[PDB]
Amino acid sequence: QVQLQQSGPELVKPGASVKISCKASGYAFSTSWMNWVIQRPGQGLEWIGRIYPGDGDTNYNGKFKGKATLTADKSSSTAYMQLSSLTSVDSAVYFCARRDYGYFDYWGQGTTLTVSSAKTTPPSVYPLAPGCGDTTGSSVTLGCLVKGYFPESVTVTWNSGSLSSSVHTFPALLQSGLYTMSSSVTVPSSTWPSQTVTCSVAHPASSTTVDKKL
Amino acid sequence: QVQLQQSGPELVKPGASVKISCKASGYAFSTSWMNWVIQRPGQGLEWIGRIYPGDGDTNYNGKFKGKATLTADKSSSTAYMQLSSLTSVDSAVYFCARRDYGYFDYWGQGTTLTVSSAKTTPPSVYPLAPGCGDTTGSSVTLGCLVKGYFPESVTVTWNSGSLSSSVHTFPALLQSGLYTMSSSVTVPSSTWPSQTVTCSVAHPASSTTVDKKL
Amino acid sequence: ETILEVNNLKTNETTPMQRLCFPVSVQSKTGELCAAFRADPGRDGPWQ
Amino acid sequence: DIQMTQSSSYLSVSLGGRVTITCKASDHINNWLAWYQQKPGNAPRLLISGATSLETGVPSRFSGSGSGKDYTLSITSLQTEDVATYYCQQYWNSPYTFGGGTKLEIKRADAAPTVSIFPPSSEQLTSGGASVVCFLNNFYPKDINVKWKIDGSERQNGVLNSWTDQDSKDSTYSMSSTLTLTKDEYERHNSYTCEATHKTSTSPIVKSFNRNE
Amino acid sequence: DIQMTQSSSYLSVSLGGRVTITCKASDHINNWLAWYQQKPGNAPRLLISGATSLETGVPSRFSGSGSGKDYTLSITSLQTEDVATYYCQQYWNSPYTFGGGTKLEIKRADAAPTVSIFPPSSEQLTSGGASVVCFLNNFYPKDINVKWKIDGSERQNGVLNSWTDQDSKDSTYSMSSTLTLTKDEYERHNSYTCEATHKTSTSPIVKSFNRNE
Amino acid sequence: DIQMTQSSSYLSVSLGGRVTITCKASDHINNWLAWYQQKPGNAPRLLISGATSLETGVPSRFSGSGSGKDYTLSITSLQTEDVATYYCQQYWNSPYTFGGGTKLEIKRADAAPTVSIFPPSSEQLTSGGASVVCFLNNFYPKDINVKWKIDGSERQNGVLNSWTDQDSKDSTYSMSSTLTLTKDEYERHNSYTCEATHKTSTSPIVKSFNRNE
């Protein structure tokens, strides 16, 4: 079998350089070309460049000609991609594939590059529940808003995972350099507020988990 | 500087010929090509033909091959365009431009050719104002209709130009060989008919200016 | 015979490989000057 | 004969935004194209030469780009003096085919029209013909349908519509319509009315008139 | 630089039916094309190679066909594991131009949305900023228009819409919107409301809110 | 294999007007094209040969023109015998690719449909199957949507729609729909109804039926 193993995610401020590893296994490393593909979230996809490990030559694109530099090592059967002058628009998902008949036969697991100047900040949950002056209707949706957490993302537990069916996990969007998310779950007014609903974020990086009651 | 000076407008009945002058200034007249462009009101635009004043050769189009004839004079630094068999569809705006790198670097001021069999007729204004039987509403629009004036166009003064903001000048459309126009201005029913509104056309060609009170 | 570099520009200093040749294409006018250079082999310029 | 299509004819963007206009031809023009700007009543003005390079005196907000048979024109940002009709030319082969053209206007909210029907003048019948008019004002967008119906009928031809473009102050349009014919048909019936259908509202406004009032 | 257009971006067919996706290029690629299948969060997977031949491990339900510059991909029938984003590649000339992509979803009837506006928290004003929210749930199809109007106005930019794609269970979507700004503008007015316009119904649902309640 | 696209399939113009039909191919055919006219139940008839020259016996109202890959057919004016399906052929290369075809019809105002549901016959249940029918008549234009709903459901497949084209007298269309299945499902419920949605009116006409009446 043929397996392509990449590295993990990277986080670095703009202006520095980053190197990404791709290691082939179960196949001759210097016999076939090794390509690279960028996917810009979420609709963009385009080809970057290829390298032949036997000679070491590189074939780049028009835009990525000066930004990326490809190297290879025949001893460890590993290909490298070095990026220079990293900006905010250079953060995307990178692929590692090989060329056989001219297509891409086998892909990689995928990697995430996030380039930003923000640092790790503890999130602060803001409660939102009905309501003052408005009893309409007998069935209302509940949730809580989360703001100012880096990086993405965090999971929101509800009553230690009591009911996951009607709750919806919304993706995060960057605002003012920080990620913001929301959650919505519907509860009838007959059982509310008889049982107190709880939303709790879990952030592994900042080691900050806040609990909130309503 | 380079300046291209054309002639004024022309009015002639169908079946005759017309010659249009274009005079270059501040540049070598025989060195560069001299083009011609027709713009049919208002959406049509297409290229006519070019001439090289040194040799005198002419390069025409497929449709304008037999209709137009281009000549040039090196002594006066002036180019000529002669049209034969003028019809109603041959009335349009003509341009005079020069060719340098293959584009048109400098244009002319533009000229208007109107080919019709109609003659000069004095206009007659027809009053229109609310109203008999209809008092609705408290704010109504006022104006007057103008018909049978040649050529276009005439200006309509309102109380010697008292209020030009809410009045709208509508373009003329040819009907039965003559041009027709209209004007609309809104006045509240509280101040009407306290002050008498007046519309007056001014036609320089026929020397006919009529005044009308309401 | 050795390669004489006719095209030398301050913009080509980053890519020295473009110095070895000069482009030619379709022209819309008559008698454009494609290139010009000094004929002295011992002068600073293309002959170096 | 190289056909070069410019689509679409009308597109509207507000100020401070970006606009993209595509001019496409049938064959390869070798990146030879010239963008033009013509204000109403004036002559065209050159902007882009060769789909890339600029001119002298033109601001840097105009940037052309493209490859193959698809070429675009990017203008950022948009101001009040940049609103005009844009053209594209192919000088690669003779004859030189000019573009269809794109007229720019500013985008705003929707406004309800105003329909007011007018009686013919009492002394208007001395000329030998009669014309009934109803004028419209303060509407948007361009496309509507004028309707003339007497006892469930529709009358064409002989109707005409004189459009008036937008101005700088209120950015509002206007329209007028009429028809001309002999005397005897005018008194054939009594009630007169007109209306204009619009897309966002299936039920338009109706303004009628009657002769014997 | 060979531009290869893949249209359209979104098309929906139910299960048990047939789907056709067209990938068209500018010039002749000599029947060299590769169809891809990429599930969210995963890597692309090869399906068709050379517009005709299949791979090893791929089911026989996938059949590619085409001639000239027009190439199609026929999938019959459709199952729950075949729903993903499909791509097309041109390996004939360098650089290799990837397709635009087509995201597949399942088609069903229309459902009315639910608009619920929420008050800001009492302790939310301690951070130095205020954000008003109204969340929508249980609607269809994708395209709608969010509307924010206070005393007949429209506020952009600063609004945002976070979409959520369909799942396997209820095949239902959701959306949220908000904006962030300083304190003093919040109490400038009183009543708050939002709505969403839809095509099949000209009159949407309105859910308002008031501060002094 | 040269694909030649003819669009669109249906277009309508009234009598006394002008009609333009475009037939476009993929490559250069060197101005070799043949326009055809086929009346229903009859054989095609040649009109234009080589995109320009006429035939012997064909009236001079038919004038073909075009250049490059875009070719048109201009017919002025239109009469009652010129209404048929028009075709275009490419004889430049083998195999000869025939056009998609354009069916012509006359344009008029809009008419409201008529929905009438019918009970099954009392002796119809002796055959071993039951079919419920509701027939529509006097409507326009072509495109509508037939709707079958019992307790908030939709039933496909097994429905069918038999269209009837326009005639010379009233220029009016008709449609019918039905389905066939076993006995036991028929009495599962009681009320029966059908309707047809239309574009200009969001609320259609409803004609229901009940078994125990």
Count helices and strands (H / E) in chain C: 0, 0
Q: Are F146 and F163 in contact (CB under 8 A)?
A: no
Structure-block tokens of residue E13: 């067919």
Q: CATH code for A3-115?
A: 2.60.40.10
The per-residue b/e assignment along D103-118, b for 16 or more CB within 10 angstroms, e otherwise, is: bbbeeeeeeebbbbbb
Q: Which of A120, A127, A125 is nearest to A178 (CA)?
A: A120
Q: CA angle, D106 as apex, D100 and D111 as ends, to 5°? A: 115
Q: How far apart are CA D101 and CA D86, in angstroms?
A: 6
Minimum CA–CA partner of D69 in chain E: E26
Coil vs helix vs strand at F119:
coil
Residues of F in contact with D153 (CB under 8 A): none
Q: Are F11 and F75 in contact (CB under 8 A)?
A: no
- Residues of F with a Cβ under 8 Å from any E Cβ are 1-3, 26, 154, 202
The per-residue b/e assignment along A101-126, b for 16 or more CB within 10 angstroms, e otherwise, is: eebbbbbbebbebebbebeebebbbb
Coil vs helix vs strand at C19:
helix
Q: Would you call A214 an interface residue with chain E, using a CB distance cutoff of 8 Å? A: no
Looking at D102-206, which runs of residues are DSSP E strands?
102-105, 114-118, 130-137, 145-148, 160-164, 174-181, 192-197
Q: Are D179 and D133 in contact (CB under 8 A)?
A: no
Give the number of beta-carbon pairs within 8 Å between D and E: 12
Pairing mode, if any, of strands D70-75 and D19-25?
A: antiparallel
Q: What is the residue type of D98?
A: F
List the domain boundaries for chain A.
3-115, 124-213
Residue A182 bridge partners (DSSP) = A145
Residues of C in contact with B102 (CB under 8 A): 28
Q: How far apart are CA E117 and CA A133, in angstroms?
A: 13
CA dihedral A148, A149, A150, A156 (to 10 degrees): -150
For A94, list phi and psi in degrees, rounded to 5. -110, 140
Domains contained in chain F, CATH given: 4-105 (2.60.40.10), 114-210 (2.60.40.10)
Q: How far apart are CA D133 and CA D180, in angstroms?
A: 10
Minimum CA–CA partner of D210 in chain B: B133
Cα A31 to chain centroid distance, Å, stands at 33
Q: Are B108 and B22 in contact (CB under 8 A)?
A: yes
Q: How far apart are CA E199 and CA E144, in angstroms?
A: 8
Give burial (CB, 10 Å; 0-12/13-18/19+) of F153: exposed
Partner chains of B (3+ C-beta pairs under 8 Å): C, D
Give the number of beta-carbon pairs within 8 Å between E and F: 12
The per-residue b/e assignment along D144-153, b for 16 or more CB within 10 angstroms, e otherwise, is: bebebeeeee
DSSP codes of every residue in F27-79: S--TT--EEEEE-TTS--EEEEETTTB--SS--TTEEEEEETTEEEEEE-S--
- D153's enclosing H/E stretch is none
Structure-block tokens of residue A202: 């879990």
Residues of E in contact with F3 (CB under 8 A): 67-68, 70
Contact F68 D2 (CB under 8 A): yes
Q: Are B32 and B100 in contact (CB under 8 A)?
A: yes
Residues of D in contact with E1 (CB under 8 A): 67-68
Neighbours of D163 (CB within 10 A): 12
Task: Using the structure block, give the residue that is written with the tokens 């009859």.
Answer: F42
Q: CA angle, F32 as apex, F28 and F37 as ends, to 5°? A: 125
Instruction: Say if domain B124-213 classifies as CATH 1.10.375.10.
Output: no
Resolution in A: 2.9
Structure-block tokens of residue A107: 């892909």
Coil vs helix vs strand at A22:
strand
One fold for both A3-115 and A124-213? yes
- E208's enclosing H/E stretch is strand E207-209
Minimum CA–CA partner of B179 in chain D: D162
Partner chains of E (3+ C-beta pairs under 8 Å): A, D, F
Looking at F68-126, which runs of residues are DSSP E strands?
70-75, 85-90, 97-98, 102-105, 114-118
Structure-block tokens of residue F180: 């066939």
Q: How far apart are CA E132 and CA D166, in angstroms?
A: 37
Neighbours of F76 (CB within 10 A): 12
Residues of F in contact with D203 (CB under 8 A): none
Structure-block tokens of residue B172: 């003329």
- Residues of D with a Cβ under 8 Å from any F Cβ are 1-3, 26, 154, 202
Minimum CA–CA partner of D2 in chain F: F68
The Cα of F203 is separated from the nearest Cα of chain E by a number of Å equal to 11
Q: Which of A109, A143, A184 sits opposite E43 (nearest CB)?
A: A109
Minimum CA–CA partner of E69 in chain F: F26
Neighbours of D203 (CB within 10 A): 8
HSE value, Cβ hemisphere, 13 Å, CA-based, for B184: 24
